C-alpha cells in the first residue's frame, strides 16, 4: 500500500497473508475454512497466516494454516487477468476469535463513489521497494467505469473495477494482490493489478467479488 | 526479435518476455527509447 496508514492492530481480522517462505500476497477469510484471493497468487503450496499485524514478529497469537485446496477461477487467464479470483480451502478450520474472523460477501455490485478500505503488506513505494512489517490500510473510493476504462484503454473486462485516486499518491502495490477491498462492511474487491503503483491516471484494478458469489457458494459446497 | 520498455518502478528499460503475469495488460512505456538504447 502506497500512501496509506498503519492499520489498528487486528482491526481487519479477515485480512490474511499468503506465505511461501515470505509474504507474497493477501487474502480474505470468508468462512472458517475458506479464503478469497487472486488467481495470479497461485502457488502449489501456500501457508495462510491469520491474525497477523506485524508479519515479521511472531507474537504467539497468529494462526498458520497450510492451504489444502487452491482453486483458481476456471476462466482465469494469466495473460489478461480476466477473472482474477481464487479460493483457498484451509487444511484445518480457522479458530474464530477477536483477531481472526470473516468478512461478508457482497450483496450488491460495486458502485462509483463508494468509500472503501484496502489493505495489505505490499510495497509502500512507487519507486523501488519497502515492504512493511505492519499491516497498511488505505481509504479509497470506487472510481467510475468510464474513468477506469479511460485509464486503461482496451484492458478493463467485466470482471474488473477501479478504486483509488486519479491524482496518484495512494494505491495498492506489489504483494497486496489477493487482499481485500471492503466497502460498507462487505468484500467488494480483490487487489489485482495496475500500471506501476500510485501513478497519476493509473489507479488500481480490482476483481469484482460480487460477480462470483454463486461460484464461491458452489465451490464451497462441492469441496466440503 | 527482442522487445524493451521502461519499468516505472525500476527506472530502467526491461525486456518483454513471454509468459509474464498480466503480459497482455502491460503498458509498454517509452518503447522507442528503450529499443533504441538496448
Amino acid at each position: 500500500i502506497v500512501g496509506g496508514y498503519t492499520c489498528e492492530e487486528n482491526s481487519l481480522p479477515y485480512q490474511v497473508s499468503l506465505n511461501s517462505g515470505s509474504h507474497f500476497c493477501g487474502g480474505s477469510l470468508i468462512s472458517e475454512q475458506w479464503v478469497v484471493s487472486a488467481a495470479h497468487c497461485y502457488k502449489t503450496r501456500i501457508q495462510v497466516r491469520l491474525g497477523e499485524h506485524n508479519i515479521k514478529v511472531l507474537e504467539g497469537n497468529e494462526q498458520f494454516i497450510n492451504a489444502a485446496k487452491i482453486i483458481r477461477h476456471p476462466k482465469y487467464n494469466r495473460d489478461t487477468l480476466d477473472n482474477d479470483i481464487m479460493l483457498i480451502k484451509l487444511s484445518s478450520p480457522a479458530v474464530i476469535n477477536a483477531r481472526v474472523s470473516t468478512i461478508s460477501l457482497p450483496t450488491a455490485p460495486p458502485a462509483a463513489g463508494t468509500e472503501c478500505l484496502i489493505s495489505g503488506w505490499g510495497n509502500t513505494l512507487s519507486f523501488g521497494a519497502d515492504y512493511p512489517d505492519e499491516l497498511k490500510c488505505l481509504d479509497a473510493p470506487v472510481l467510475t467505469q468510464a474513468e477506469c476504462k479511460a485509464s486503461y484503454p482496451g484492458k478493463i473486462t467485466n470482471s474488473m473495477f477501479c478504486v483509488g485516486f486519479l491524482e496518484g499518491g495512494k494505491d495498492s502495490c506489489q504483494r497486496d494482490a489477493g487482499g481485500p477491498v471492503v466497502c460498507n462492511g462487505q468484500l467488494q474487491g480483490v487487489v489485482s493489478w495496475g500500471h506501476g503503483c500510485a501513478w497519476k491516471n493509473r489507479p488500481g484494478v480490482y476483481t469484482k467479488v460480487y460477480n462470483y458469489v454463486d461460484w464461491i457458494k458452489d465451490t464451497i459446497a462441492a469441496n466440503s | 526479435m527482442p522487445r524493451w520498455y521502461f519499468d516505472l518502478s525500476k527506472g530502467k528499460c526491461v525486456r518483454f518476455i513471454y509468459g509474464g503475469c498480466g503480459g497482455n495488460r502491460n503498458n509498454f512505456e517509452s518503447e522507442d527509447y528503450c529499443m533504441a538504447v538496448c
Binding site: 489485482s192 488500481g204 | 524493451w4 528499460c13 526491461v14 518483454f16 503498458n27
Partner: peptide, 14 residues
C-alpha cells in the same frame, strides 16, 4: 549500459 536492465519486468500484477 546501465539503463538496459537484465532484471525481469515487474509487470502489472500486484
Amino acid at each position: 549500459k546501465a539503463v538496459c536492465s537484465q532484471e525481469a519486468m515487474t509487470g502489472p500484477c500486484r
